[PDB]
Ligand binder design. Structure first.
Ligand code: NA
Length: 342
């Protein structure tokens, strides 16, 4: 089932390293479970490394695979990054990634490694109690907010902005486990993570550019405007009134570089590893039949991964590395699934 199985091949064959970091923000009590203490976060780094002959890191542990999928099969999948490999010479521009609500940061692995293979330092962030998360010493915390109807998505976005600013403090500061080019920082995220990517850019002058991968906004638009680059990349919003109006309200206060793309035949999960997880390793009725259209659409796992990687890389190459791309400006015959809403 998993013998020799891997995540989608990244853009290049450069050596990649990976590290997992346990960060504790001791200035803030945890917003959802303050009895547990201060706000802690788990982060996965992917980065260009020196060559290593060690095997690549697994996608996930067996216990966390059980928590995410319902069985351990994903623990047999290998990535393309070597745990603890020494970083390559020059500090690289940093892209920070935030997952969808209830979803592990591991669901952005194919994207993260791909950006790393293109020459970026990448940090995927877990937001505790908003996903199953594995901490050091085998401690797995549950998505306790997933159960709770008292969850406010605006509160989640506002707190995630604080989480992400703290991650930037740690990765750009003197004690960092990975030296990055702090002059060039991008943030992207899936669903509520995408709303949070834009939110942190509003709050933090160090963030240069942001991508929202199909998240509704849950905070009111800035009255002063947001003049920094934003890509809105959604799924099925061409024929969904509520998602379209949500993004139209945000669009009016985006005062700088901006694009709004749609994947009309995609699904909400198109911008993550979930299509690949479900299509290759999913149980019978992993996503129930009535939700398949909305969550996955008809875009294959391979195309979902390719489209997301290519457009995300195009955006960050444009704003962080001075490289143009026609993908951001006009229809692409190599990506017939992508349309322009503006
Ligand atoms: Na979600």
């Amino acid at each position: 089932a998993t013998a020799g199985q891997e995540v989608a091949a990244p853009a290049t064959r450069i050596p990649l390293g990976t590290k997992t970091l346990h960060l504790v923000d001791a200035s803030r009590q945890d917003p959802w479970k303050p009895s547990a203490g201060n706000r802690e976060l788990m982060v996965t780094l992917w980065y260009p490394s020196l060559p290593s002959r060690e095997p690549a890191a697994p996608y996930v542990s067996k216990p966390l695979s059980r928590a995410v999928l319902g069985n351990d099969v994903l623990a047999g999948v290998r990535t393309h990054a070597v745990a603890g490999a020494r970083p390559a010479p020059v500090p690289r521009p940093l892209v920070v990634l935030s997952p969808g609500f209830g979803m592990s940061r591991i669901t952005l692995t194919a994207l993260g490694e791909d950006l790393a293979s293109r020459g970026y330092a990448v940090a995927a962030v877990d937001h505790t109690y908003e996903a199953p998360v594995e901490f050091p010493g085998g401690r797995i915390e549950k998505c306790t907010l997933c159960d709770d109807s008292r969850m406010d998505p605006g509160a989640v976005v506002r707190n995630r902005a604080k989480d992400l600013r703290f991650v930037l403090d740690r990765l750009t500061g003197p004690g960092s486990e990975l030296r990055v080019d702090a002059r060039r920082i991008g943030v992207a995220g899936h669903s509520i993570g995408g709303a949070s990517a834009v939110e942190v850019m509003r709050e933090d002058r160090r963030v240069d550019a942001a991508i929202n991968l199909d998240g509704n906004f849950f905070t009111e638009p800035p009255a002063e405007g947001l003049n920094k680059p934003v890509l809105l990349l959604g799924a099925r919003r061409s024929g969904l009134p509520e998602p379209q109006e949500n993004w139209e309200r945000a669009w009016k206060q985006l005062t700088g570089w901006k694009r709004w793309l749609d994947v009309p035949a995609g699904g909400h999960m198109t911008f993550t590893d979930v299509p690949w997880i479900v299509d290759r390793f999913g149980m019978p009725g992993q996503i129930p039949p009535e939700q398949v259209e909305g969550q996955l659409g008809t875009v294959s796992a391979a195309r979902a991964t390719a489209v997301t990687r290519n457009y995300v890389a195009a955006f960050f190459d444009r704003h962080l590395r001075g490289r143009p791309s026609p993908l951001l400006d006009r229809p692409s015959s190599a990506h017939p699934e992508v349309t322009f809403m503006k």
